[PDB]
Swiss-Prot record, chains A, B:
Name this protein carries in UniProt: Thiol:disulfide interchange protein DsbG
Disruption phenotype: No visible phenotype.
One example of a Gene Ontology biological process annotation: chaperone-mediated protein folding
Species whose genome carries this gene: Escherichia coli (strain K12)
UniProt xrefs under Pfam families: DsbC_N, Thioredoxin_2
Cysteines engaged in disulfide bonds, as pairs: C108-C111
Recorded consequence of changing C108A: Complete loss of redox activity
Subunit structure: Homodimer. Interacts with ErfK, YbiS and YnhG.
Effect of C108S: No loss of chaperone activity
Length: 229, 229
């Protein structure tokens, strides 16, 4: 059974997930208090346990690294894949190291403003924006989004559309094609699954490889983080 | 110099107070982050350190015990002594295990209400209230407080005074004696030193032997704690 010291910490409202190997002959226990991940370390004397964060000589918070890798990283791994497998439009270099997904609607001022804010990083080749269009804000959103998808170079058309603040004139098709309709519907369901119905809904990966979200127009700090700066 | 792992934690905004002996061949470091006490433990491998709370087999939070004994207990040790050395009035058994000091004014509804709330514990002999009178609320507060001190049995008179909701009739002396004036002035300065100018200002010791304060009429939980329940 569980060592007495660890059982004492459980009584403090902690639920253990699993054990793991720790340095110095110490045994580790990964757990959670509410929605917060925690690490517990059984001492060498075996009669004590420490609930806290372990750091190494290089100054790395190993407990944080573990909690993010084992508890947070897995959370949005599938979501990231679903976005990657969707019909997104490329804005920037195909080999840009930083990938950012954005669910956007044609009639969305903040989508346009975010597009402008990102220019420095996209143009430098550091970041690539992958846009998943949706048609949910205005009556004409579906048709306009489909019209963009229907153009000769959808990615370029979207870029011009955002740059113009949504004023760019478009060739309006007689109807939304079944493929365009599928893309829009599939994208809206994924957006819904991600939990944010407001556009722009921006998704990115932290330096620790965990899925992050930003809804609306990012402030300066959030923008810099989304851009991997 | 300080081990690398510990130096890393210092960079996280911690200032070390001193080192201490920890179990399992671990070295302990007592510090503070802002006004918060923290304990750091250097691992046996010496290449890691854990910032957190250590628990023993009996479930005692040793880090909390240490932080309170070394950081908090000393804080009000002198204040407690100054109260004990003042001219307080006894309400309850001289040998009551729980001692509670109260700075009170004669014209104070909440002082009276707190007096009533404490009856169960005082009458059972568990708690003794030691009142340090002050005359700061009303123009007549000084004279009334002195009149109580001037009575045949000051402690009994105060008890009757509080029980009556401040209606008890008193023999009013021609003036405040120099001794009464000294008691009132000394008590007001100590009260001022404690940081609370509002009466009642209640002082007590926690189960961990640290000085606690309650200002105004305690709610049910605070009352139970003051009474050592």
């Amino acid at each position: 059974e569980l060592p007495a010291p660890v059982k004492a910490i459980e009584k403090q409202g902690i639920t253990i997930i699993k054990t793991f190997d720790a340095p110095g002959g110490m045994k580790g226990y990964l757990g959670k208090y509410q929605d917060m991940g925690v690490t517990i370390y059984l001492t060498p004397d075996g009669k004590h346990a420490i609930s806290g964060y372990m750091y190494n000589e290089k100054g790395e918070n190993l407990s944080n690294t573990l909690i993010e890798k084992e508890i947070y990283a897995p959370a949005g791994r599938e979501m990231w894949q679903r976005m990657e497998q969707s019909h997104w439009l490329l804005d920037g270099k195909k080999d840009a190291p930083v990938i950012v997904y954005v669910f956007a609607d044609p009639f969305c001022p903040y989508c346009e403003q975010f597009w402008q804010q990102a220019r420095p990083w996209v143009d430098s080749g550091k970041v690539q924006l992958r846009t998943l269009l949706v048609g949910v804000i205005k009556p004409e959103s579906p048709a306009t989004a489909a019209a963009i998808l229907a153009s000769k170079d959808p990615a370029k058309t979207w870029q011009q559309y955002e740059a113009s603040g949504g004023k760019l004139k478009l060739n309006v098709p007689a109807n939304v094609s079944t493929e365009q309709m599928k893309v829009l519907s599939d994208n809206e369901k994924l957006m819904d699954d991600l939990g944010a119905n407001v556009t722009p809904a921006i998704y990115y990966m932290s330096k620790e490889n965990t899925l992050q979200q930003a809804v609306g127009l990012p402030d300066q700090k959030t923008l810099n983080i989304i851009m991997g700066n």
